[PDB]
Every structure is written in structure tokens, then in C-alpha cells.
């Protein structure tokens, strides 16, 4: 699979069913509905997990308290660096699994149409399969159920 389809507007994952006369796309609502839930749960988890995080406070020190002034500065910068790292890393982790989540679902949908029809159909590649009979728009939608 080289590139994506610009034509597909409805959903994220879908079937491009092309009958003897007609030709058009169709989004898989069974997968796309479950996908919108998966993304909205992971984003809210990142929001809730980072609520306990360091809060810097202004402290003042005189000219002969330079050591503790420096200690204070180092300490507050220290925690801000730690939580910056945690936030950035968690985003990279969530991004990795989000893209793998998409590739997982696309390839699961490939195997769904392939595996369901063992002796009747054989997968040529890129999603598409073979048959011993022609397939009208009525037949095209039959693979879903």
C-alpha cells in the first residue's frame, strides 16, 4: 500500500466497492465509531494523569542569602525540567501507539474480508479479493454482514 485515497471523505476506515456499472466509496461505521472512542479516551488520560505536577512559587532573598537563593532557583528549574520531559515523552508514546492503532485497524479490515471467505475467495493483495462469480452493488455490501 503506497499512498492514501483523497476521495475518501466520510470516515477513516472504509471499503471502496466498485460494481459492474457503478463505482464509489463507503466508510466502515463499525470500526470508525470504535476508533473515535479510542482516540478521545487516550487524550483525556494525558490530561488527568498530569494534574499532580510541580507548581513554582515566587520566593525572595536578600543580598547575603545568595546560596539559598541559588538552591531555590535550581530546585524549581529542576522540577520544571522533570515535568517538561515527562509531558513531552508521554506525547511521543501516545503518538506512536495512535499511528500503530491506525495501521492495526486497516490491516485487521484486510483480514476480515479475506478470512471470512476462505474457500470462496482468495486475497490478491492491497485489500482486494477473488471470486467464482460476478458481484453487483447488492453483492458488494453482502461482505459486511
Amino acid at each position: 500500500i503506497e499512498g492514501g485515497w483523497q476521495g475518501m471523505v466520510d470516515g477513516w476506515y472504509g471499503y471502496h466497492h466498485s460494481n459492474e456499472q457503478g463505482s464509489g466509496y463507503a466508510a466502515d461505521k463499525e470500526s470508525t465509531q470504535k476508533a473515535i472512542d479510542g482516540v478521545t479516551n487516550k487524550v483525556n488520560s494525558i490530561i488527568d494523569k498530569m494534574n499532580t505536577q510541580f507548581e513554582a512559587v515566587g520566593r525572595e532573598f536578600n543580598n547575603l542569602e545568595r546560596r539559598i537563593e541559588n538552591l531555590n532557583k535550581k530546585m524549581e528549574d529542576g522540577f520544571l525540567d522533570v515535568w517538561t520531559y515527562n509531558a513531552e515523552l508521554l506525547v511521543l508514546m501516545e503518538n506512536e501507539r495512535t499511528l500503530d492503532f491506525h495501521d492495526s485497524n486497516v490491516k485487521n479490515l484486510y483480514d476480515k474480508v479475506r478470512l471470512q471467505l476462505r474457500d470462496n475467495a482468495k486475497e490478491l493483495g492491497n485489500g482486494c479479493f477473488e471470486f467464482y462469480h460476478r458481484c453487483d452493488n447488492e453483492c458488494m455490501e453482502s461482505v459486511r454482514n
Binding site: 500500500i1 499512498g3 492514501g4 485515497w5 483523497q6 475518501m8 471523505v9 470516515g11 477513516w12 476506515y13 472504509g14 471499503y15 471502496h16 466497492h17 466498485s18 460494481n19 482516540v39 487524550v43 494525558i46 490530561i47 498530569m50 494534574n51 505536577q53 507548581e55 513554582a56 512559587v57 515566587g58 520566593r59 525572595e60 536578600n62 542569602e65 524549581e76 520544571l80 525540567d81 515535568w83 517538561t84 509531558a87 513531552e88 506525547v91 511521543l92 508514546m93 501516545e94 503518538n95 506512536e96 495512535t98 499511528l99 491506525h102 486497516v106 479490515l109 484486510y110 474480508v113 492491497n126 485489500g127 482486494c128 479479493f129 471470486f131 460476478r134 458481484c135 458488494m140 461482505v143
Partner: protein, 319 residues
């Protein structure tokens, strides 16, 4: 007849990062980092801050004549002070444990200033000549408003014995000071007595101060110095002063009427006639983002601060 499976694509150029990859182009993405602020100091949830303008905390509390705007301020949400306020100790010197006082002030939202020793109550001392050109007001020599620089009267300075009992329900912030003169002649000229002291007592305070004569550089035109002190006088406790000279006596003191979350913010900005839920020293934030990178020192209901320049989540597929 040929059905095939595939995924969505577009002409976007928004990019995200991964653990193993960087600058990956995606069809959809969700920014979660707030980078904008309004550039103004605002009310915090309806409550206006105390903006000290060109005055310091010391200038405000002691009553530097240039700081008369702040003689009786209303309840505040936070305090704003410039990095280097011009109106501080007009008469040069220092404020003892200043930083600890500021720390306490960061937990206070409102004072009620009251007169505890009337200026008119000093019968055997001169109470209306305690002024300096270091503390100008409308083109004339003046002084801090909330304390009184007493000097001798009819070539005499009788020993002062004065007490104030805190009959209020509130803790009381009390301020006083000592004058460190330039030389022995100045000492006798102002106070008559050559060797002096100030003693101060409460249930916890046990202070006896002696003036230090030294030859010092002019600051704001003066080589003399004033050193100021403070205590929290508890309800039903009393403060007792004794002195035969050099005493900068209390006139007004501050009842602590409301405590809560506050802060002293350092900022050069002025009041921006606005309201916010989240203030930083360089501007207010109004955002539903979980993170921001505006400034680490915030007050209010804010997103979490990070040092990141960019923080973008992947939502759609690769492009």
C-alpha cells in the same frame, strides 16, 4: 468487479513526532500547548490585584509620602511590584527580616489599617518636626506616614514608657524603628541624651536596640539611617516600648482581616481593565489547553506549565 481497502489522505502539512520518528506528516493533529496570552494584568475571578506602581512593599507599609495612593487599600487577589521600585525607603536604611514579612504578606488578602498611637498623644516630646528632604512631599520635607520621628522638646527627652494592648480579634502587624545618627553632636541636637536605647516587649518579643553612630555615604542626600522592625501582636497581647531617644514610634498598624492564597508578582505591566482565571507576570491566560509555556509563576486555575516550544498529538493517520 473489484472491491479494495484503503485509508484517507489530504493536502495538509501538519507534522508530529514519535519516539522513533520525527517530523511525520499527518492528515489530522491536535495541539495541546497554549502559547498565547493577553499581555495584561487582570482581576482574578472578579477580584482586583494590588498594583503598587512605583512603590515597594516597604514604601507602602511604612507610608512613604510618594505612596499615598495606598494608604488604605481594599481586598486584593494578588500583589504586583516592579523589579526596582523607585519609592522604597525614602529616608535611607533597612527593613529587618523584610523577606520574611513579604512571605507572610503572600498569605494575606486584606489589611484594615488602624491608629494605635495618636501623634497628638506625645505631650513631652516634639512629634511634628520629624521630617527630611530625603522624603519629599509636594515640594517640602516630609516623612513616612505610619510611624513618627520624635525629637526632644524644650531641650529634654524624658524616658518614654508606652504600651498598646491589642483589644481587637485580629492579629496586628506593628511597625517601629530606630534612627542611627551621623555623630555625637547630631545625637545631642535631636535627642539631648548622649547614650540611648529602645526596649520592646511582648509575650514573645524581647528587644533592646542601641543606635550606631558611623560615618556613612549620602543616600537620597542623607548620611543618617533608619532601621525598621516589625512584629505580629496577637489578640489580647500587649507591646511595651521604652526609650530615651532615637525612637521612631508607631502611629498606625495593620489588622490582618483576611488570609488566603496570594502572591507577590514581579512585573512591569500596569492594570489592564480585564478579568481572568489565570495570571502570569507577562499576561493573562484564557485557554482550555492542558499545557502552556507562557511563564512558570502563575496564579489561579491554570494549565500545567512546560518549557516545550511545541506539543502536538497525532489523531489521524500518516499523510
Amino acid at each position: 468487479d473489484q472491491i479494495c481497502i484503503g485509508y484517507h489522505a489530504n493536502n495538509s502539512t501538519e507534522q508530529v513526532d514519535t519516539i522513533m520518528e520525527k517530523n511525520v506528516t499527518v492528515t489530522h493533529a491536535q495541539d495541546i500547548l497554549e502559547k498565547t496570552h493577553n499581555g495584561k494584568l487582570c482581576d482574578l475571578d472578579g477580584v482586583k490585584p494590588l498594583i503598587l506602581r512605583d512603590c515597594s512593599v516597604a514604601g507602602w507599609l511604612l507610608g512613604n509620602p510618594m505612596c499615598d495612593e495606598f494608604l488604605n487599600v481594599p481586598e486584593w487577589s494578588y500583589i504586583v511590584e516592579k523589579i526596582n521600585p523607585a519609592n522604597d525607603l525614602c529616608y535611607p536604611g533597612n527593613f529587618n527580616d523584610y523577606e520574611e514579612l513579604k512571605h507572610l504578606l503572600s498569605r494575606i488578602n486584606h489589611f484594615e489599617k488602624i491608629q494605635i498611637i495618636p501623634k497628638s498623644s506625645w505631650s513631652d516630646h516634639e512629634a511634628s518636626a520629624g521630617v527630611s528632604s530625603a522624603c519629599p512631599y509636594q515640594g517640602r520635607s516630609s516623612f513616612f506616614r505610619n510611624v513618627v520621628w520624635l525629637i526632644k522638646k524644650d531641650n529634654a527627652y524624658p524616658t518614654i514608657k508606652r504600651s498598646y494592648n491589642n483589644t481587637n480579634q485580629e492579629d496586628l502587624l506593628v511597625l517601629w524603628g530606630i534612627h542611627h545618627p551621623n555623630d555625637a553632636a547630631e545625637q545631642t541636637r535631636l535627642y539631648q541624651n548622649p547614650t540611648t536605647y529602645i526596649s520592646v516587649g511582648t509575650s514573645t518579643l524581647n528587644q533592646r536596640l542601641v543606635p550606631k553612630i558611623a560615618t556613612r555615604s549620602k543616600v537620597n542626600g542623607q548620611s543618617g539611617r533608619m532601621e525598621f522592625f516589625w512584629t505580629i501582636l496577637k489578640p489580647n497581647d500587649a507591646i511595651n516600648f521604652e526609650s530615651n531617644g532615637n525612637f521612631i514610634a508607631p502611629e498606625n498598624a495593620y489588622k490582618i482581616v483576611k488570609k488566603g492564597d496570594s502572591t507577590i508578582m514581579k512585573s512591569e505591566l500596569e492594570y489592564g481593565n480585564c478579568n481572568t482565571k489565570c495570571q502570569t507576570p507577562i499576561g493573562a491566560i484564557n485557554s482550555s489547553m492542558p499545557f502552556h509555556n507562557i511563564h512558570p509563576l502563575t496564579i489561579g486555575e491554570c494549565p500545567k506549565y512546560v518549557k516545550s516550544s511545541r506539543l502536538v498529538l497525532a489523531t489521524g493517520l500518516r499523510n
